[PDB]
């Protein structure tokens, strides 16, 4: 599994800030747009993209405040990410796309699809966000920690002051051990503690136990859309998983229209770090049948 990031930087200015993105592949077709979540960056897709780039443009932005993107002093609510990503997609002049999405990148991607359904030719997803209606439906192992994250005192001290999202949660969501070179690529955006704001606001935005009500309603809405949408869907899952355990993947195979599920083997949350090759090869094999309208 590769540790390098052999992609030239591209930048676009949106809403007063520079966003960095990967942009590789042919320009004359339907691009594939890869959206990372917390606390990652386009680095998460580094070993997946090379499987797709031979046939399709691959665009992988760093969300505002993350990766190599600028780090304004925002609250970094989901709504802020929504504004930045919508402007990013329009600045690149994207029309129809295929989405490849994970964690908060999946909340952004499903929210944009629901709002632009005619522009989405397929959704590949993994470990995505849906409502977690009560705390008993959050994984028991992670429950105490995420309850602690969702406070103004303890949560800020763990995430911002001590970097828990990078030094504990990230490695704990990968089965295999991350290397120090990989850990340094993920630590880089957040070397200054004050730049860790998005890493704390994100778990405070998760739709758990009805709170916050605005995100619970928005995520309910894109899930209702997704359950009724004929859009082709490709869902990667692992064992034991985190947000999407094997039995939930099986349930979604049945309840989401035109959904293919792929078992990637061992995996927790950051499935891209456990089996990037199968993820990338299965996305590449799935694209051609989406082309025809
Ligand atoms: Cl989060």
Curated annotation (Swiss-Prot):
<dbReference type="InterPro" id="IPR050266">
    <property type="entry name" value="AB_hydrolase_sf"/>
</dbReference>
<comment type="pathway">
    <text>Xenobiotic degradation; haloalkane degradation.</text>
</comment>
<dbReference type="Pfam" id="PF00561">
    <property type="entry name" value="Abhydrolase_1"/>
</dbReference>
<comment type="function">
    <text>Catalyzes hydrolytic cleavage of carbon-halogen bonds in halogenated aliphatic compounds, leading to the formation of the corresponding primary alcohols, halide ions and protons.</text>
</comment>
<feature type="domain" description="AB hydrolase-1">
    <location>
        <begin position="31"/>
        <end position="155"/>
    </location>
</feature>
<dbReference type="GO" id="GO:0009636">
    <property type="term" value="P:response to toxic substance"/>
</dbReference>
<comment type="subunit">
    <text>Monomer.</text>
</comment>
<comment type="similarity">
    <text>Belongs to the haloalkane dehalogenase family. Type 2 subfamily.</text>
</comment>
<dbReference type="InterPro" id="IPR023594">
    <property type="entry name" value="Haloalkane_dehalogenase_2"/>
</dbReference>
<dbReference type="GO" id="GO:0018786">
    <property type="term" value="F:haloalkane dehalogenase activity"/>
</dbReference>
<protein>
    <recommendedName>
        <fullName>Haloalkane dehalogenase</fullName>
        <ecNumber>3.8.1.5</ecNumber>
    </recommendedName>
</protein>
<feature type="active site" description="Proton acceptor">
    <location>
        <position position="269"/>
    </location>
</feature>
<dbReference type="InterPro" id="IPR000639">
    <property type="entry name" value="Epox_hydrolase-like"/>
</dbReference>
<feature type="active site" description="Proton donor">
    <location>
        <position position="127"/>
    </location>
</feature>
<keyword id="KW-0378">Hydrolase</keyword>
<dbReference type="InterPro" id="IPR029058">
    <property type="entry name" value="AB_hydrolase_fold"/>
</dbReference>
<dbReference type="InterPro" id="IPR000073">
    <property type="entry name" value="AB_hydrolase_1"/>
</dbReference>
<feature type="active site" description="Nucleophile">
    <location>
        <position position="103"/>
    </location>
</feature>
<keyword id="KW-0216">Detoxification</keyword>
<dbReference type="GO" id="GO:0016020">
    <property type="term" value="C:membrane"/>
</dbReference>
